Symmetry: D2
Subunit: 217 residues, 4 copies
Amino acid sequence: NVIKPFMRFKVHMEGSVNGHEFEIEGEGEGKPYEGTQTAKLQVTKGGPLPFAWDILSPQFSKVYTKHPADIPDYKKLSFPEGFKWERVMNFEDGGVVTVTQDSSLQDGTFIYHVKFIGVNFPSDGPVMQKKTLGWEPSTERLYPRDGVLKGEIHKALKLKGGGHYLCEFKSIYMAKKPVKLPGYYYVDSKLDITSHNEDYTVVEQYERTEARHHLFL
Amino acid sequence: NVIKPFMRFKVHMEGSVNGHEFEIEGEGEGKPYEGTQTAKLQVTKGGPLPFAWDILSPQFSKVYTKHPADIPDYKKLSFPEGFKWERVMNFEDGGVVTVTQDSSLQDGTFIYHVKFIGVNFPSDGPVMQKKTLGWEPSTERLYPRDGVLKGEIHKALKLKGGGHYLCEFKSIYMAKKPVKLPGYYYVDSKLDITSHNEDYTVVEQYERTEARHHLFL
Amino acid sequence: NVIKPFMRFKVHMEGSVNGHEFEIEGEGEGKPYEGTQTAKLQVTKGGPLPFAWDILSPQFSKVYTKHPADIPDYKKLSFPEGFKWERVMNFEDGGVVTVTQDSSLQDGVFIYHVKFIGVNFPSDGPVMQKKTLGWEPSTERLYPRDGVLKGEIHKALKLKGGGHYLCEFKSIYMAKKPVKLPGYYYVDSKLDITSHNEDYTVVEQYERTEARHHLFL
Amino acid sequence: VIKPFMRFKVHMEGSVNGHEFEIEGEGEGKPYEGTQTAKLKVTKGGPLPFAWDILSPQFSKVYTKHPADIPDYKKLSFPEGFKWERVMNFEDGGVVTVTQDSSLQDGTFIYHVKFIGVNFPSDGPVMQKKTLGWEPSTERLYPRDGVLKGEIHKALKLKGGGHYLCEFKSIYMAKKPVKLPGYYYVDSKLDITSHNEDYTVVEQYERTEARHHLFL
């Protein structure tokens, strides 16, 4: 309206982990108002990836998040111009990533451009040894700051022997024009790898994602 | 069974913020299995406090948290012996607190000993200028690690002229005897300052707390 | 042997700060063994830059660092194959940067390729308001870890008026073939902007750089 | 104040991983030559179940050698004195805050220290006592918020070889207005000169000097 009850997107990423460059191409679709989507992703360059696909999986779409009527939907309101998002990921073993992303809309399909640099992963750690088994579901804490929208999450990857490998997300969401800002609130997400080929050069994903107030408010 | 539907506690804190020492005495009570409680705190030494009361309020009782029967209640199970808890608080402007606490059971009443060293608060910041107006409610991500329980929270204090002052909590919970650990889960909390005297040398608090799975699990 | 008493280098940077992309091209030269070098940089895309040049200056060459005989010069020994380096920069106001870099030798001229994503700079901060006036000289603490060379530095940019805007550097240096690693030691650096055009689309740099043991060793 | 040789006395109350302890000690040195020694006894909660090295830098930067062109903020603060505070961030999650009062009583420095260290892995170098002293270090200092601050990238040496890393952040606060320095460095080297078997008695020596950057 311009955001419709079902939209597709196209995604191009250029990325690096521990000096190893790579490029990924993909597409996706889902229900902006219900907060459900999928994506199919292809490692078009730099593959097969010598590290855990899981660290990339959350870089591939928060326009698709269900909102109640009283929490302004900053991300949907940014369109048709759209928004950019940027991120820091801090892993507990020193691994650090920054991400920068541009989200725009062309003939009613979203266009995603991602760049990703990851550094300081230990060579014997769960990322470069490929010991991660998916993300736990997560809860983001968001609020307005500095005229834009910010949010953070304590996330966790599951580990082969058991246990968790932890990572802190800090995100910034920046509309390409003035749009109404919401207050302090939460977004729940559960991202799954629904299927993949042997070496993870083709990967399909599913995310559920919904905004809400704190349950005691 | 040892933890009864209604339980009282007493609390003793010795603390320091920015070189300035203080003591606080208090008491409280509520319902361990419903996850509600209240408490009255009185500043016995080093009052009136030259910093925001808000940074101390969450150091005054997680034995009182509603658990569903499928989430092992580590803290309740630790009694009669009980548990210790420790914490890091990282404020966005450099302020850092560590906290160490002892929780025991004495004649049917909980005994709390707290010690608290906070450092690096800017002199013109919201803590030392007492510009804070209570915490948002909050959600803690917890998980087992290193034979004990740990949890983190992205918290925030409301700011006079509007805005938020952010603070990350990391907590560690240590039973004094072997007790069953839980898995990956959350805890919702809302702490309110229900009243206070003019210079915050006496303050009443109320907290609601509940353990649960992620909403999409 | 392959590293001569005087060498030139060429550098290509693709960067982004707070969603805003740019390219920079340049060439330099110095004396690898004396630890002195200059460079001239030109912004070829996304100019004039909407942020402080100073955050870019240290991404434009530690092969040019003086080394006593008793400290293995890992960077020099990596050649002719060369080495990659990577970096986290953590600014005190929440600005974060990751950098990834490739360093190779082509016809007796060093070739540098650099990518740079900076996120989460406050809109009114020293960086986006261009209020920085060069770096203090600095001392890096280095050591072998995980089969590569790592080093960290507490740096600071000078501010208009007085004062400092602080920045932690963490760096990883990865030789492209097996080379002898040094032990615990330091590197002193002083980087200067020797000249610049009106809008920092053309800028020249000088760095003096020396390795040494701690003065009391 | 400050005389060419002064004594100090120190009382520490600390906690690591929920285990409390008290320590008592005395020390002496040459405040203008930046050398000093100390002798510490664990008076309570010993033998300590964690590595002594995390405690050793909490036992005196008045004894640091200053060139004449860098204001000696800490010396100037007397007889009133200063306080100092610290955060220690260990690469494996261990965190400490430290708070300290330094005052001059009857020609002798009196030190009160409090220390809460938390979040050390049970299987890590601190709680398994696998450390072997600090590397020498270089601290970066500047004025900020009307006081003096400095930071350091420090490292404990490890049994099987290697390093256990720790960032220090210190705040030094004079009890009266005194002249602030600008941007400079402090080198230090702290040694454990002797200790009894289970570290209930320990002797340290530290050499410390302020300076500009070597290229300045």
